[PDB]
Structure 1
Amino acid sequence: MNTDITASTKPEYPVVDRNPPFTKVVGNFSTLDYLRFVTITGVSVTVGYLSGIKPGIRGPSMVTGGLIGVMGGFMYAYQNSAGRLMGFFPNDDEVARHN
């Protein structure tokens, strides 16, 4: 079963870990990652709120916007952290730790 991680491009940065497990990445987050997550969730909730003031469901639209926001933000943060764990992104503090 082709369950191997190799990329057509190459990890131009150091290669601290090739295929990190889930919990490792999601606990490897950085302050910038949480900021990205919070920003996405916030903008989503606000646009949901207004687009809900239009038809009178300010609440439920806020909840749905929140769901989409958490989904997108966590996916973006996990993507950034995974990149920094592999080499496809700048690694300074990850290399510091793994040293």
Structure 2
Amino acid sequence: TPTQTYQFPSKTVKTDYPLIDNDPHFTRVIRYARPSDYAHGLAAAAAGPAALWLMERISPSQVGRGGFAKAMRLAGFIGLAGGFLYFYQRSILRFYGMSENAREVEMDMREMTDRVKAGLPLYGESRLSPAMQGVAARQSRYSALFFGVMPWFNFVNHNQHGVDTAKYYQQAERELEAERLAREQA
């Protein structure tokens, strides 16, 4: 127990499900993503180029020989762009508590409690300064709520995630204690 589980003032948002992280790391968002997120992301992605093709067949552009091929590559880039942003947003809303995250709470509790008992920092270690870690956190907190305008991702290992961390240390205490007596009573 570091004795300061909540160390930074954080914004509380009225949502419907428990908050896991105000700012998850990019690798965790991909890791906790459900296979439905993959279908949803790819479905949206293909929708961009497919809309341009369908719009070509029905109302023809009357362009010259290479124009449609250039346009399809641009529609294709915007498909992969929008499709990955939509896929990444679907997973992050469960960390934010803005989508049903019941499965993800279980995964998170396991990973962080298994980090605590391994002696690891809960969220990793940054090559950035404590102060730059603070600046980064204050930029990516609830950021995916703004992808329709500006894209931002978390690539910094900081410890400002909006959550009291006592629960992680409490379960690690109760899990080492559960295994200690079993190891010594048999």
Bin the TM-score by the shorter chain.
Answer: 0.7 to 0.9
RMSD in angstroms over aligned alpha carbons?
Answer: 2.2
Q: In structure 1, what residue type is equivalent to 2:36?
A: L
Is the helix fraction higher in 1 or 2? 1
Relative to structure 1, the CA distance from residue 50 to residue 60 in structure 2 (aligned partners, 3 Å threshold; closer, same or farther) is farther
Separation in structure 2 between the aligned mates of residue 84 and residue 41 of structure 1, nearest angstrom: 21
Indicate conservation of the 8 Å contact 2:45/2:80, yes or no: yes
Instruction: After superposing the two structures, state which structure 1 stretch, 51-60 or 17-26, moved more.
Output: 51-60
Mapping of 1:39-54 within 5 angstroms? 39-51=43-55, 54=61
Note the alpha carbon deviations across 1:35-78, whole angstroms, 9 max, x for none.
11111111111123345562243322211111111111111111
1:29 to 19, 33, 38: 33
Mapping of 1:1-99 within 5 angstroms? 6=11, 9-51=13-55, 54=61, 55-56=63-64, 57-99=67-109
Give the structure-1-normalised TM-score.
0.76
Instruction: After superposing the two structures, state which structure 1 stretch, 32-41 or 53-62, moved more.
Output: 53-62
- Structure 1 residue runs of 4 or more that deviate by more than 4 Å after TM superposition: 50-53
Aligned length in residues: 95
Question: Structure 2: any 5+ residue segments left out of the alignment?
Answer: 1-8, 110-186
